[PDB]
Design a binder for this molecule. Structure first.
Ligand SMILES: [Ca+2]
Ligand SMILES: [Ca+2]
Ligand SMILES: [Ca+2]
Lengths: 220, 216
């Protein structure tokens, strides 16, 4: 039973978490919701809605639908302005190329909407509508809800239990475990080995190259 | 014996670690040296020399000096984005109020320090501070913390080092100081503890709220 692959995008295949953080920071500052950047970095990988609720509750207050919407817009705009900073992570393309050449099926699964996802894909010189990908616009709920991964397993014709989830955030690992998939964590999104293991990572690697070099430990 | 306090600055009292990461990345790309952000982030808190050195393993002197200057210019451009971390001002004032001595100790030079101190509204010449310009080596070498203890006239052994990075924690243990880790630099609790942190708090407000677990 050959392994099928569900990849997170931002922080996992492209070096874009820190741009995402900066974009949220600028949006939140614009809206007088001053939050230290480590707290924003902690939530990267959740869909914006859940992230906003989450930061909200942890600061003791709550954010209306209307401001959530504006924060979202501000975030997309700030991200766009940072689009050319985004580079593919080491091994990322080579890993994807390895899988195709090997007939292993993979899908991308991101809490980002079509906009962010199109930007990061450029860095991997990939055309969105030419690959297997699921976005926040494809489901009701983002990470850590299992929705995205389930839709991804479905898009590639693999049972979710024949799947390996690859992610850089607590939220990817959490969602992986919630649908009982096998989760593997990458350090390239800035989360540490401790956090990723506690959120359910079975193995943790530096980046796609490191993972590629150990593909046997973890995939068939 | 009352506790004396040695604070890291960048990421401990000010929320500047991400600007620091971003200035390093700007400087690296200008020199066409590819490097993932997380790798840069892992190093913030070492001296620029150790940093770049350590980076290569994972760079000419000529090249190194261009990067140091490029980083300093890029970091300046980002100064307006930097603000105090919650509780940082209150914590320092609480220490003053209680006549507890403190000193700031940073691996950066006077230029980055000054920028960071502005967010605390501190006068660099009106406070106890030690920078990379006052010692031979930056963190994790114990030099700065030793300088800092000397500047406030306290045994390093009766000092709390408060930092956000693995390099702070390492240096603290290397001079037998008690180390406390803050999450506000983006390092995790596991990292900070494995580098020697005795306690780990979220930020200066969390620390101030738990000050009794940790300080006499
Ligand atoms: Ca991610
Ligand atoms: Ca981290
Ligand atoms: Ca620091």
């Amino acid at each position: 039973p050959q392994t099928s692959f569900i990849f997170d995008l931002d922080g996992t295949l492209t070096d874009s978490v820190y741009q995402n953080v900066a974009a949220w920071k600028e949006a939140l500052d614009a809206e007088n919701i001053p939050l230290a950047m480590w707290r924003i970095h902690r939530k990267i990988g959740m869909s914006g809605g859940l992230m906003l609720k989450s930061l909200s509750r942890e600061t003791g207050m709550s954010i209306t639908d209307e401001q959530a919407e504006r924060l979202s817009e501000k975030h997309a705009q700030a991200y766009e302005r940072l689009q050319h900073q985004i580079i593919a992570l080491p091994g990322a393309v080579e890993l994807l190329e390895t899988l195709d050449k090997e007939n292993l099926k993979w899908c991308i699964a991101t809490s980002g909407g079509i906009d962010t996802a199109t930007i990061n894909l450029k860095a991997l010189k990939l055309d969105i509508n030419k690959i297997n990908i699921v976005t926040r616009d494809d489901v009701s709920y983002g990470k850590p809800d299992p929705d995205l991964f389930l839709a991804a397993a479905k898009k590639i014709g693999a049972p979710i239990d024949e799947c390996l989830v690859i992610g850089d955030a607590i939220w990817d690992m959490l969602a992986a475990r919630r649908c009982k998939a096998t989760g593997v964590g990458l350090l390239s999104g800035g989360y540490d080995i401790g956090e990723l293991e506690r959120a359910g990572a079975l193995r943790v690697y530096e980046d796609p190259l490191d993972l590629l070099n150990h593909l046997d430990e973890i995939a068939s």
